Design a protein around this ligand. Structure first.
Ligand SMILES: CCCCCCCCCCCCCCCCCC(=O)OC[C@H](COP(=O)([O-])OCC(O)COP(=O)([O-])OC[C@@H](COC(=O)CCCCCCCCCCCCCCCCC)OC(=O)CCCCCCCCCCCCCCCCC)OC(=O)CCCCCCCCCCCCCCCCC
Ligand SMILES: Cc1cc2nc3c(=O)[nH]c(=O)nc-3n(C[C@H](O)[C@H](O)[C@H](O)COP(=O)(O)O)c2cc1C
Ligand code: SF4
Lengths: 56, 215
């Protein structure tokens, strides 16, 4: 947040707390909009044997 | 069968008791034996029913190539019967009941012996390919499943598969056996089961070696 020191002090004193610590506007701390590919595991019924449907 | 019909008149001429004197109970008579594979003297011979396998090989076939210690496996009753390793081959008799207790069956008494210088997976896969080429295609379990077994077996020889599949293959064979019209499906399922049961470490080692070689 690009607010001057005097404005920061005034808003902090009017609010009664430190506002720069917990800002309601988002900045570079959010995750990137491009992400690596996922791998996405499979479930328990993905066996090649001992996996008859009548038992599950 | 030809042998049954051809022995009936001698049984009539000489008596049922004379024929029944040979072999154990419920295993009477004299049976023709074919010895082939890794023996010094492959031959066809007539001999008493309940002969030991080792005795038969060492007496009539001249022994297994490279001595008895060189034996790896035997298919005792034709390709349909499952194979048995040396440990059980040492003291097994040649008749229906004794060979059933060894989880094989007497079959047609066609002994095919293999020493330790042959690829057991390749031999079983060749038998499965024979069965794939011989099925009539009438019923779906034999047709489809024997083709599937053939494809899986070819990969197994290479070692291109994974360890988890072996169990898969075992399950597939079970599905075929007892569900087909005739016993060709059983005769294709049993050799695979015998190979798995007695040589799973060889399949696992081949798969591991392939995986190491291919990264
Ligand atoms: C009051 C006198 C006027 C000065 C003033 O208001 O500056 C407030 C100035 C900036 O405070 P801020 O809101 O925290 O700063 C936001 C950034 O500076 C935002 O800075 P920026 O990078 O967005 O630059 C925008 C720039 C230019 O933006 C503009 O031109 C729009 C302003 C037009 C208004 C005329 O701002 C100005 O120069 C105009 C300020 C007001 C001029 C009157 O604060 C003070 O000087 C304290 C004054 C005491 C408070 C009572
Ligand atoms: C796929 C298949 C192939 C067979 N081929 C023969 C064969 O070539 N010769 C034979 O005598 N029996 C063969 N049999 C077994 C026959 O059913 C058998 O001859 C029949 O049961 C009567 O034989 P038996 O005189 O021993 O009682 C075959 C069975 C199957 C399932
Ligand atoms: S099991 Fe017998 S009837 Fe069925 S497809 Fe195979 S050979 Fe034909």
């Amino acid at each position: 947040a690009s607010a001057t020191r005097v404005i920061q002090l005034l808003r902090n004193w009017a609010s009664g707390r430190d506002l720069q610590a917990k800002l309601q506007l988002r900045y570079q701390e959010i995750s990137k909009r491009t992400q690596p590919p996922p791998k996405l595991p499979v479930g328990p019924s993905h066996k090649l044997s001992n996996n008859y449907y009548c038992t599950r | 069968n030809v042998e049954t019909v051809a022995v009936s008149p001698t049984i009539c001429r000489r008596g049922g008791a004379w024929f029944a004197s040979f072999g154990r109970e419920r295993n009477s008579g004299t049976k023709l034996f074919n010895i082939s594979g890794h023996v010094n003297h492959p031959c066809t011979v007539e001999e008493e029913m309940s002969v030991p396998l080792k005795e038969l090989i060492e007496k009539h076939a001249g022994g297994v190539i490279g001595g008895w210690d060189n034996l790896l496996a035997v298919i005792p009753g034709g390709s349909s019967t499952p194979l048995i390793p040396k440990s059980v081959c040492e003291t097994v008799l040649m008749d229906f009941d004794a060979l059933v207790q060894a989880q094989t069956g007497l079959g047609t008494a066609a002994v095919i012996v293999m020493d330790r210088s042959t690829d057991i997976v390749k031999a079983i896969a060749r038998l499965i390919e024979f069965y794939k080429h011989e099925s009539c295609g009438q019923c779906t379990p034999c047709r489809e499943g024997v083709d599937w077994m053939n494809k899986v077996m070819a990969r197994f020889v290479k070692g291109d598969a994974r360890p988890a599949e072996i169990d898969s293959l075992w399950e597939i064979s079970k599905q075929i056996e007892g569900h087909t019209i005739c016993a060709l499906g059983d005769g294709a399922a049993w050799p695979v089961q015998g190979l798995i049961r007695h040589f799973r470490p060889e399949l696992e080692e081949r798969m591991q070696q392939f995986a190491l070689q291919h990264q």
